[PDB]
Design a protein around this ligand. Structure first.
Ligand SMILES: C[C@@H]1CC[C@@]2(OC1)O[C@H]1[C@@H](O)[C@H]3[C@@H]4CC[C@H]5C[C@@H](O[C@@H]6O[C@H](CO)[C@H](O[C@@H]7O[C@H](CO)[C@@H](O)[C@H](O[C@@H]8OC[C@@H](O)[C@H](O)[C@H]8O)[C@H]7O[C@@H]7O[C@H](CO)[C@H](O)[C@H](O[C@@H]8O[C@H](CO)[C@@H](O)[C@H](O)[C@H]8O)[C@H]7O)[C@H](O)[C@H]6O)[C@H](O)C[C@]5(C)[C@H]4CC[C@]3(C)[C@H]1[C@@H]2C
Ligand SMILES: *[C@@H]1O[C@H](CO)[C@@H](O[C@@H]2O[C@H](CO)[C@@H](O[C@@H]3O[C@H](CO[C@H]4O[C@H](CO)[C@@H](O)[C@H](O)[C@@H]4O)[C@@H](O)[C@H](O[C@H]4O[C@H](CO)[C@@H](O)[C@H](O)[C@@H]4O[C@H]4O[C@H](CO)[C@@H](O)[C@H](O)[C@@H]4O[C@H]4O[C@H](CO)[C@@H](O)[C@H](O)[C@@H]4O)[C@@H]3O)[C@H](O)[C@H]2NC(C)=O)[C@H](O)[C@H]1NC(C)=O
Ligand SMILES: CCCCCCCC/C=C\CCCCCCCC(=O)OC[C@H](COP(=O)(O)OCCN)OC(=O)CCCCCCC/C=C\CCCCCCCC
Ligand SMILES: CCCCCCCC/C=C\CCCCCCCC(=O)OC[C@H](COP(=O)(O)OCCN)OC(=O)CCCCCCC/C=C\CCCCCCCC
Ligand SMILES: CCCCCCCC/C=C\CCCCCCCC(=O)OC[C@H](COP(=O)(O)OCCN)OC(=O)CCCCCCC/C=C\CCCCCCCC
Ligand SMILES: CCCCCCCC/C=C\CCCCCCCC(=O)OC[C@H](COP(=O)(O)OCCN)OC(=O)CCCCCCC/C=C\CCCCCCCC
Ligand SMILES: *[C@@H]1O[C@H](CO)[C@@H](O[C@@H]2O[C@H](CO)[C@@H](O)[C@H](O)[C@H]2NC(C)=O)[C@H](O)[C@H]1NC(C)=O
Ligand SMILES: *[C@@H]1O[C@H](CO)[C@@H](O)[C@H](O)[C@H]1NC(C)=O
Ligand SMILES: *[C@@H]1O[C@H](CO)[C@@H](O)[C@H](O)[C@H]1NC(C)=O
Ligand SMILES: [Mg+2]
Lengths: 111, 148, 253, 434, 196, 43, 35, 85
C-alpha cells in the first residue's frame, strides 16, 4: 500500500422500531375508560359512599392527612419530570416530619 | 484540530458514541525561499482504535496566504465506546513525511441522554396504567377513612 | 472455655491475618519504589503492560494506564498479553506496539526467594495464550526433552529465547563476583553465557532487591533496519566481515 | 533608559564563586563623584536575562559593617543604591556589593556515566557592564578545581590567566561604558548534586491550647545534574558503592534537613505512603529517598515535626493579649535553590492580625480562612506569602507577625463544641418525648 | 454513576457505571461528608476507606445481638455479639486495611435477616418493607445477594410443606418479594437478571 | 481461594464453637418454631 | 504512638472484660427473672 | 517598620501556657468520667414518669453541665491524642 488505500465507512446498526400512534392511542383510551368505570362503580353502583365525615379539629387532621398523601404523589410526579434526587429527598423530608405527626394524630383520633 | 459539528470543542463537552465531529488540518510547502499552499488530493484521515474504523479522504476547503486547509465532512462517530486515535499521516515517497495523531476517549451514552419515556410512542400505554393505578389508589385511600 | 476463646481469637489475628500485602516484613518494599518511579519519572499518558494480577495496584499507586487488571472480563485481551510475554522478542515488539505500550514491568524473586514471581506463573501464561493460538505457541517446547521445566543451562531453546526469560535474567549471572549465580526460588545454577541479549527493549529501572524490573520499548529504527541487525552490528563489529557477496532479494517494486 | 552619568569607577575588581550550586558575585568598587551638586544615588546594571533570576542584593561600605538601602527597580535593568550622607562633589569612597543569582551552568556533555565527573558551562560577560565609565577592572573566578575556556578569543589580552585555585583576568587600563560585546563562556568541574526545589509549600500551625507549633513541608525536588547514558542499571550502582567511590557523586542518596533547636515527632511521608529510611539525630534529620535521584528525576515528598511554642511567641508588655510571632522562613537541605515558596501561617480560630513584616521582599501576601479539626465556625486564619527566588542558607530571615487573641475568644473553643452537644441532647429529648 | 474509565483495558476502556456495585463507595462518601460538614473533623478519604471495616465491625455485632434476641431471650443475644466481635473467621476479611465489599456485606446480611424474622414472626407489612429496603441495599453493596434470594424462599417453602402455613407468611413474603425484586432491578449491574 | 479445605481450618478460626454448633442445631430441632426452621436451613 | 505489645494487652483486656460482664449479666438474669 | 517590630519582639516576655501539655491526659480522663456520670442521669430523668415541666427542668439543668464538661474534655483528649486543638 505504498501509494493509496481504499476508503472505509462504518455501517451502523438499525435502531429498534417504534409502533404506530393510533394503536397506542386506542390502548390508552381503553385504560382511561376502564379507570372511569372503576370510579363509577365505587361511587354509585356499589353503594360505597361517604357515610360519615370528620368535623372540627378531626376534620383539620383529615385535611392534613389528605395533604400528606397527595403531596407525596405530587413529589413523585415532579421527580418523574427530571428533578434531582437530592431535591426530591429534601422535599420529602420537609413533608414527612409534619405529615407523619398529623397522620398519626388522625389515625389515633379517628377509629 | 477536531471539534464538534456545531463549534464546541472537546474540552467543553467530551465526545460520545454516535456524535457528529469534524477534522481539519493545514499543509504548507517550502520551495526554497518561502512557504506556499500545498495542493494535494491524496491525503487520508484515519480514526482507529487498533485497526481503522474511519478512513476518509480530505478535500480542500480552506485557503491562506501560506497554508492550504483540508477538512472532512461531518461524520458520525462509531457505535462503540473506546479510546480512539485520530490520525493523519501523509507519507508518499519523493517528499517529506508528516504525522500528527491524538488519542481521545469516546464514552458511552449516559442515563440522562436516552430518549425519555414519553417521547417514545410504543410506551404510551405503560404510563397510562401507572397514572390510572396511582389515581385509583389515591381515591381509594380517601374513601377508606370516610366509610362506615 | 470463653477465656481460651479470647486468648485464641487474639493470637490468630495477631499472627496470621495481620500481614501487610504491599511490604514484605522479611522490612523490604520494592513494589512501592517501582510504582513511585513510574508515577514520578514517566509521562502521564504512558501505558504499562504487566500480568493481570497487578493492574489494580498499578492503577492505584503508579497512576498509569494499564492493559489488563484483576476483574478479568475480556479473556482474549489477557491472552494477548500472555502471547506477548511468551514469544520471541521480535514478535513481542510487534504485538506490544500496535497497542501503544511504552513500559513493561516484570516481577523476579530470584535474589530474595519470593516464590510468587512471574517466571513460575509463566505456565499459566502459556496455557491462556495457547487456548486461542495453538500454532503460535506450544507448551511442549518450553519443557526440556525429558519433560522437566528448567531455567538452567540445560533448558529448552524455546524458553531460552522467550521474552520473560530474557527480561527477568538480564544481569543476574554477573551479579555474583564468581560468575556462577544461584537462583533461590528454583535452586538452579545460571552461567553468564545462557541469557541472550535483549535487542528490542532496554532496562530503565530495577529495585534494590531486583524484585520489580521495568523495561521500555525501543523506538523503531530511523533507517528502517530491523533492530536485531542493529544489535548484531553493535555486538559483532570488527570480525564480521565478508569480502563480496551479491545479495539475494526480491525485485524492487 | 540610561541614568545621568554622575560617578566614575576608579577601581573595579569582581570575583565569582561557583563552588556551591549558585553563582555568588562579589564586586569591590572604589568610586569618585563628578564635580557637581552633591548627589546621593547609584545604579548598578544587570543584564535583562540575569535580572530575571536574582535572589539577594546587598551593598555596604568596607569601613562600616552596617549595610545601605539597596533596592531593585521595577535591555539593561538597574538596581538602586542610596547613601546615608550626601557624597562630596570631589570625594573617593570604597564600596562592596554582593549579589546571589539563581542560575548555575548547564551540564556540558549532558550525558555522563554515573561514575564519571561532570563539567558545567556558564556564559557571562567579560568586560564589566556598568552605567558609568570605568578606569580599571579585574575579573576573577574561584571555587573550582579546574577551569577551561570555550572558543577562546584570538586576542591575547582577552585571555584568562590560570592560578592554582583561581582563574583571573588581566586588568584593562581603559574601558568604555555600556560595553557588552564579548560573551565569555567557561567550563568548570563541579561534582555537587545540583538540587532544585521546583515548588515548596510549608505550613505553620500555631496553637495556644496545646502550646505547640508544628511544621509541615511539601518538597518537589528535581536534580539538575547531567543525565546518565545507557539508562539506569542497579548492578553498576550496587557494585560501585561497595568500593570507596561514594565521595562526591552527582546523584542524591541522603538529604540532611536542619530543623530548629528542639524538635519532636518527626515524620517523613511520600505520595504513596510512609518511607521508613529516615533517621533523626540531634538537630539533624537524615532522609533517604526511595530511589537515588539521578539527573532529571523528580521526587515529591513531605516532612513534618513539632516544636514548643514558647520559643516563637512573645506576649507584649503593655497588654497580655497582644502576641508577636517570629516564624523562620526556610530550613531545608544545606545548599538548594527554591523556584517558588508558599509560606502559610495558620493563626488560631479567633486571631486578628495587626502587623506583618518580612526581611525578604515577597511577591504576594494574602489573608484567608481555612477550617481544620474541631473548627466549627470560620476555622483558622491563614496568612500566606508567596516568594519567587530564594537560596537555602543565605536567605535566612524571620517573618514577624503581630496579632491579638483575647480571652473572650480563647475560651470560645470549648463552648463551640458544648453548643453542638447541647443541641444534640435537646434534639434527642424532643425526639424521644414526642 | 456514569464513569467511563479510559485508564484501564487501554484500547477498549471500561464502563464503570454498569460493571460495579456502588454501595460501598456511596457509604464511604456519605460518612466522609458527614464527618466533614456536620462534626467539624475533616478526615482524608484514605483514612475513612482504611478504617471503614473496623467501624462497621460493631454494627454487625449489634445486628447479631438483635437477631439472636428473636430466636431466644435477650440474654442469649449478647453472647452471640461477644462471639462475632472477636472471631478469626470474620476478622480475616475485615482487618483494618481491607476495603472490600464484604466489609459492608455481612452487616446487611444480618440486618435483613433480622427484619425478615421480625416480619415472619409477627406478620406485619412495615417489617417486610424494611427487609426489602435492606435487601436492595445489600444488592447494591455486594454480589452475594443471591444467597438471600435463594434462602428466604427456602424458609417459606419449608414452612409451606411442613403444614404451618398461616395468614402471616402470605403478607410477609409477598410484600418482601414484590418490593425487593423491583427495587433490586434498579442496579445497572443487576439489570434484568431477577427475572431471567 | 476457590478450593475445598480440610478440618484444621475450621477449628483454626472458630475455637470451641465448632462442637457447640451441632449441639445448637440439635437443640433447635428439639422445639421447632417458625424461625428455628430458618436458622436450621441457613446452618 | 502506642506500641504493639501494648495494643495486644489492650485487646486481651477488652475481650476479658466483655466476656466477664456478659456472664455477670446472664447470671443475674437467670435468677432475677421469673422462671 | 521591621526594625521596631524586631526590637519589640526580643524585649517582651515569653509565652506561658495555660495548662501544660504533660498534665492534660489526667484532666481528659477525669472529665470523661464526669461527663458520662452526669449524662446518664439525664436519660434516667427523661425516661422517668413525672410532670413534663419538672422533667424538662431537671433535664436541661443537668444537661448544660454535661455539655460544658464534654466540650472541655474533647479538647484535652484531642490534644493528648496528638491532634492539637
Ligand atoms: C471508654 C474508652 C476510653 C478511651 C479508651 O477506650 C475506652 O480507653 C483508653 C485507655 O485509657 C488507653 C490508654 C491507657 C494509658 C496508656 C499509657 C501508655 O503510655 C506509655 O507511653 C510512654 C511514652 O513515653 C510513657 O512513658 C508511659 O506512661 C507509657 O509507657 C500509652 O502508650 C498507651 C495508653 C495511652 C492507652 C492507649 C489507649 C487508650 C487511650 C484507651 C482508649 C482511647
Ligand atoms: C476483547 O478483546 C479482544 C482483543 O483485544 C477484542 O477482539 C477484537 O475485536 C475486534 C472487533 O470485534 C476485531 O476486529 C475485527 O476482526 C475481524 C476478524 O476478521 C478475520 O477474518 C478476516 C477475513 O474475513 C480477516 O481479514 C481479518 O484480518 C481477521 O483475520 C475483522 O474482519 C474486522 O474487520 C472489519 O472491521 C475493521 C475495523 O473497522 C475494518 O478495518 C475491516 O475492513 C472490516 O470492516 C468491515 O466490517 C466492519 C464491521 O463493522 C464494517 O464497519 C466495515 O465497513 C467493513 O464492512 C465491509 O465488510 C463487511 C463484512 O464483510 C460487509 O458487510 C460490508 O458491507 C463491507 O463490505 C475487525 O478487524 C479484532 O480482530 C479482535 N481481536 C482478536 C485478537 O480477536 C474483543 O472485541 C474484546 N471484547 C469486547 C467485548 O470488546
Ligand atoms: C421514598 C423512599 C424510597 C426509597 C427506596 C429505594 C429504592 C429506589 C432505588 C432507586 C433510587 C436510586 C437513586 O436515588 O439514584 C437516582 C439517580 C439520579 O437520578 P437523577 O438524574 O437525579 O433524576 C432522574 C429523573 N428521572 O438515578 C440513577 O441513575 C441511579 C442508578 C442506580 C442507583 C444506584 C443506587 C445507589 C446506592 C444505593 C444505596 C446507597 C445508599 C447509602 C446511603 C447511606
Ligand atoms: C462536635 C464534636 C463531637 C466529637 C466526636 C468525636 C468522634 C471522633 C470519631 C472520629 C475518629 C476518627 C479517627 C481517624 C484516625 O484514627 O486516623 C488514623 C490515623 C492514621 O492517619 P495517618 O495518615 O497515618 O496520619 C499520621 C501522620 N503523622 O491514626 C491511626 O491509625 C489510629 C487509629 C485509631 C482507631 C480509631 C477507630 C475509630 C473508627 C472511626 C471510623 C472513621
Ligand atoms: C478519651 C480518653 C482520653 C485518654 C487520654 C490518653 C491518650 C494517650 O495518652 O495516648 C497517647 C498515644 C500516643 O500519643 P503520641 O502520638 O505519642 O502524642 C504525644 C503528644 N503528647 O495516642 C495513641 O496513639 C493511641 C492510638 C489509639 C488507641 C488505639 C485503640 C483504640 C480502641 C478503640 C476504642 C473505641 C471504643 C469506644 C466506643
Ligand atoms: C474514638 C476514640 C479514640 C480515637 C483515636 C484517635 C487517636 C489517633 C488519631 C490520629 O492519630 O490523628 C491522625 C490525623 C492527623 O491529622 P494531620 O493530617 O496530621 O493534621 C495536619 C496538621 N499538621 O488526625 C486525623 O486524621 C483525624 C483525628 C481526629 C479525631 C481525634 C478525636 C479524639 C477523640 C475526641
Ligand atoms: C511532582 O513534582 C513535579 C515537579 O514539580 C511535578 O511535575 C510538574 O507537573 C506539572 C503537571 O503535570 C507540569 O505542568 C510541570 O511542568 C511539571 N514540572 C516539571 C519540573 O516537570 C508533578 O506534577 C508533581 N506530582 C506528581 C504526582 O508527579
Ligand atoms: C488562495 O490563496 C492564494 C495565496 O494567498 C491566493 O494567491 C489565491 O488567489 C487564493 N485563491 C482563492 C480561490 O482564494
Ligand atoms: C495574590 O493573591 C491573591 C489571593 O488569592 C490573588 O487574588 C491575587 O490575584 C494574587 N496576585 C498576584 C499578583 O499573584
Ligand atoms: Mg471481591
Amino acid at each position: 500500500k505504498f501509494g493509496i488505500k481504499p476508503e472505509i465507512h462504518h455501517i451502523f446498526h438499525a435502531e429498534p422500531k417504534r409502533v404506530a400512534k393510533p394503536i397506542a392511542v386506542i390502548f390508552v383510551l381503553i385504560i382511561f375508560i376502564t379507570i372511569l368505570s372503576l370510579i363509577v362503580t365505587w361511587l354509585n353502583s356499589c353503594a360505597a359512599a361517604f357515610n360519615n365525615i370528620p368535623t372540627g379539629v378531626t376534620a383539620v387532621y383529615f385535611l392534613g392527612f389528605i395533604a400528606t398523601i397527595v403531596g407525596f404523589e405530587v413529589i413523585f410526579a415532579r421527580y418523574y419530570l427530571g428533578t434531582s434526587i437530592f431535591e426530591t429527598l429534601f422535599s420529602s423530608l420537609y413533608l414527612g416530619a409534619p405529615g407523619l405527626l398529623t397522620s398519626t394524630k388522625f389515625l389515633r383520633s379517628f377509629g | 484540530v477536531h471539534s464538534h459539528a456545531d463549534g464546541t470543542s472537546y474540552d467543553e463537552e467530551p465526545y460520545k458514541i454516535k456524535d457528529k465531529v469534524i477534522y481539519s488540518v493545514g499543509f504548507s510547502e517550502w520551495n526554497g525561499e518561502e512557504w506556499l499552499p500545498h495542493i494535494a488530493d491524496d491525503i487520508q484521515f484515519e480514526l482507529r482504535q487498533v485497526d481503522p474504523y474511519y478512513r476518509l479522504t480530505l478535500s480542500p476547503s480552506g485557503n491562506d496566504s501560506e497554508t492550504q486547509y483540508y477538512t472532512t465532512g461531518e461524520f458520525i462517530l462509531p457505535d462503540r465506546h473506546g479510546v480512539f486515535t485520530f490520525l493523519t499521516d501523509y507519507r508518499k515517497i519523493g517528499l517529506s513525511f508528516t504525522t500528527d495523531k491524538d488519542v481521545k476517549a469516546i464514552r458511552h451514552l449516559a442515563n440522562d441522554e436516552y430518549p425519555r419515556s414519553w417521547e417514545i410512542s410504543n410506551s404510551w400505554v405503560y404510563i397510562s396504567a401507572i397514572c390510572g393505578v396511582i389515581v385509583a389508589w389515591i381515591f381509594f385511600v380517601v374513601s377508606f377513612v370516610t366509610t362506615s | 472455655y470463653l477465656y481460651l476463646f479470647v486468648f485464641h481469637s487474639t493470637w490468630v489475628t495477631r499472627t496470621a491475618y495481620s500481614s501487610p500485602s504491599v511490604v514484605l516484613p522479611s522490612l523490604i518494599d520494592d513494589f512501592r519504589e517501582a510504582y513511585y518511579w513510574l508515577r514520578m519519572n514517566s509521562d502521564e499518558d504512558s501505558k504499562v503492560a504487566a500480568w493481570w494480577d497487578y493492574g489494580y495496584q498499578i492503577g492505584g499507586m503508579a497512576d498509569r494506564t494499564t492493559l489488563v487488571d484483576n476483574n478479568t472480563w475480556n479473556n482474549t485481551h489477557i491472552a494477548i498479553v500472555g502471547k506477548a510475554m511468551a514469544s520471541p522478542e521480535e514478535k513481542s515488539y510487534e504485538i506490544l506496539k500496535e497497542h501503544d505500550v511504552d513500559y513493561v514491568l516484570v516481577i523476579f524473586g530470584g535474589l530474595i526467594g519470593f516464590g510468587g514471581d512471574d517466571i513460575n506463573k509463566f505456565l499459566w501464561m502459556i496455557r491462556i495464550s495457547e487456548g486461542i493460538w495453538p500454532e503460535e505457541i506450544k507448551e511442549r517446547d518450553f519443557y526440556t526433552a525429558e519433560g522437566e521445566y528448567r531455567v538452567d543451562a540445560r533448558a529448552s531453546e524455546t524458553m531460552r529465547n522467550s521474552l520473560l526469560y530474557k527480561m527477568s535474567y538480564k544481569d543476574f549471572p554477573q551479579l555474583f563476583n564468581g560468575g556462577q549465580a544461584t537462583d533461590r526460588v528454583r535452586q538452579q545454577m545460571i552461567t553468564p553465557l545462557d541469557v541472550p541479549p535483549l535487542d528490542y527493549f532496554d532496562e530503565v529501572f530495577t529495585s534494590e532487591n531486583w524484585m520489580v524490573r521495568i523495561y521500555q520499548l525501543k523506538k523503531d529504527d530511523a533507517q528502517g533496519r530491523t533492530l536485531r541487525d542493529v544489535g548484531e552490528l553493535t555486538r559483532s563489529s570488527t570480525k564480521t566481515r565478508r569480502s563480496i557477496k551479491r545479495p539475494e532479494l526480491g525485485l524492487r517494486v | 533608559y540610561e541614568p545621568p552619568a554622575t560617578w566614575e569607577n576608579v577601581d573595579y575588581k569582581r570575583t565569582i564563586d561557583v563552588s556551591n550550586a549558585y553563582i555568588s558575585e562579589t564586586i569591590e568598587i572604589t568610586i569618585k563623584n563628578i564635580a557637581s551638586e552633591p548627589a546621593t544615588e547609584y545604579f548598578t546594571a544587570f543584564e535583562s536575562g540575569i535580572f530575571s533570576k536574582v535572589s539577594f542584593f546587598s551593598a555596604y561600605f568596607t569601613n562600616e559593617a552596617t549595610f545601605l538601602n539597596s533596592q531593585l527597580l521595577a535591555e539593561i535593568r538597574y538596581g538602586i543604591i542610596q547613601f546615608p550622607n550626601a557624597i562630596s562633589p570631589q570625594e573617593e569612597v570604597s564600596l562592596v556589593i554582593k549579589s546571589f543569582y539563581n542560575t548555575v551552568g548547564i551540564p556540558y556533555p549532558e550525558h555522563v556515566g554515573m561514575s564519571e565527573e561532570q563539567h558545567l558551562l556558564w556564559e557571562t560577560n567579560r568586560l564589566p557592564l556598568s552605567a558609568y565609565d570605568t578606569k580599571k577592572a579585574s575579573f576573577t573566578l574561584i571555587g573550582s578545581s579546574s577551569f577551561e575556556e570555550y572558543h577562546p578569543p584570538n586576542d591575547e589580552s582577552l585571555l584568562g590567566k590560570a592560578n592554582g585555585n583561581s582563574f583571573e583576568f588581566g586588568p584593562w587600563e581603559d574601558i568604555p561604558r555600556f560595553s557588552s560585546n564579548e560573551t565569555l563562556a567557561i567550563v568548570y568541574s563541579h561534582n555537587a548534586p545540583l538540587n532544585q526545589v521546583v515548588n515548596l509549600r510549608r505550613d505553620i500551625w500555631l496553637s495556644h491550647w496545646a502550646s505547640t507549633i508544628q511544621f509541615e513541608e511539601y518538597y518537589e525536588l528535581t536534580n539538575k545534574a547531567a543525565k546518565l547514558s545507557k539508562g539506569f542499571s542497579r548492578l553498576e550502582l550496587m557494585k560501585q558503592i561497595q568500593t570507596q567511590n561514594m565521595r562526591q557523586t552527582h546523584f542524591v542518596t541522603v538529604l540532611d534537613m536542619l530543623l530548629p533547636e528542639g524538635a519532636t515527632d518527626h515524620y517523613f511521608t511520600d505520595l504513596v505512603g510512609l518511607v521508613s529510611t529516615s533517621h533523626a539525630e540531634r538537630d539533624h534529620f537524615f532522609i533517604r529517598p526511595r530511589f537515588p535521584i539521578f539527573g532529571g528525576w523528580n521526587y515529591n515528598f513531605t516532612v513534618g515535626w513539632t516544636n514548643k511554642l514558647s520559643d516563637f511567641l512573645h506576649v507584649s508588655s503593655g497588654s497580655d493579649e497582644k502576641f508577636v510571632a517570629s516564624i523562620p522562613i526556610l530550613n531545608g537541605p544545606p545548599d538548594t535553590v527554591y523556584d517558588n515558596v508558599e509560606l502559610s501561617v495558620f493563626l488560631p480560630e479567633g486571631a486578628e492580625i495587626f502587623d506583618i513584616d518580612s526581611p525578604v521582599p515577597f511577591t504576594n501576601v494574602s489573608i484567608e480562612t481555612q477550617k481544620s479539626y474541631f473548627d466549627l465556625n470560620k476555622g483558622h486564619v491563614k496568612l500566606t506569602f508567596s516568594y519567587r527566588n530564594l537560596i537555602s542558607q543565605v536567605a535566612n530571615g524571620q517573618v514577624l507577625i503581630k496579632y491579638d487573641y483575647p480571652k473572650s475568644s480563647f475560651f470560645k473553643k470549648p463552648l463551640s463544641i458544648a453548643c453542638y452537644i447541647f443541641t444534640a441532647l435537646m434534639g434527642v429529648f424532643v425526639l424521644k418525648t414526642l | 454513576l456514569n464513569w467511563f474509565d479510559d485508564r484501564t483495558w487501554y484500547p477498549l476502556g471500561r464502563v464503570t457505571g454498569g460493571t460495579l456495585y456502588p454501595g460501598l463507595m456511596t457509604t464511604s462518601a456519605f460518612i466522609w461528608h458527614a464527618l466533614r460538614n456536620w462534626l467539624g473533623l475533616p478526615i482524608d478519604i484514605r483514612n475513612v476507606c482504611v478504617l471503614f471495616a473496623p467501624l462497621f465491625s460493631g454494627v454487625t455485632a449489634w445486628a447479631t445481638y438483635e437477631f439472636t434476641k428473636e430466636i431466644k431471650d435477650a440474654s442469649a443475644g449478647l453472647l452471640a455479639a461477644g462471639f462475632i466481635a472477636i472471631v478469626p473467621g470474620y476478622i480475616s476479611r475485615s482487618v483494618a486495611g481491607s476495603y472490600d465489599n464484604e466489609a459492608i456485606a455481612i452487616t446487611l446480611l444480618m440486618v435483613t435477616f433480622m427484619f425478615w424474622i421480625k416480619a415472619q414472626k409477627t406478620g406485619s407489612i412495615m417489617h417486610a418493607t424494611c427487609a426489602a429496603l435492606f435487601y436492595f441495599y445489600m444488592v447494591s453493596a455486594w454480589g452475594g445477594y443471591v444467597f438471600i434470594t435463594n434462602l428466604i424462599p427456602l424458609h417459606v417453602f419449608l414452612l409451606i410443606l411442613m403444614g404451618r402455613y398461616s395468614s402471616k407468611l402470605y403478607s410477609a413474603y409477598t410484600t418482601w418479594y414484590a418490593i425487593g425484586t423491583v427495587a433490586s432491578m434498579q442496579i445497572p449491574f443487576v439489570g434484568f437478571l431477577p427475572i431471567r | 481461594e476457590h478450593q475445598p479445605v480440610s478440618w484444621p481450618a475450621f477449628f483454626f478460626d472458630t475455637h470451641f464453637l465448632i462442637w457447640l454448633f451441632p449441639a445448637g442445631v440439635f437443640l433447635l430441632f428439639l422445639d421447632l418454631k417458625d424461625e428455628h426452621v430458618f436458622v436450621i436451613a441457613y446452618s | 504512638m502506642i506500641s504493639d505489645e501494648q495494643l495486644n494487652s489492650l485487646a486481651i483486656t477488652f475481650g476479658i472484660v466483655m466476656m466477664t460482664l456478659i456472664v455477670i449479666y446472664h447470671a443475674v438474669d437467670s435468677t432475677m427473672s421469673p422462671k | 517598620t521591621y526594625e521596631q517590630l524586631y526590637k519589640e519582639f526580643h524585649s517582651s516576655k515569653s509565652f506561658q501556657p495555660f495548662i501544660h501539655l504533660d498534665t492534660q491526659p489526667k484532666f481528659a480522663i477525669c472529665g470523661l468520667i464526669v461527663t458520662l456520670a452526669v449524662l446518664s442521669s439525664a436519660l434516667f430523668a427523661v425516661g422517668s414518669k413525672s410532670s413534663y415541666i419538672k422533667k424538662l427542668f431537671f433535664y436541661t439543668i443537668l444537661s448544660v453541665i454535661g455539655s460544658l464538661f464534654a466540650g472541655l474534655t474533647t479538647v484535652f483528649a484531642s490534644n493528648s491524642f496528638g491532634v492539637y486543638v
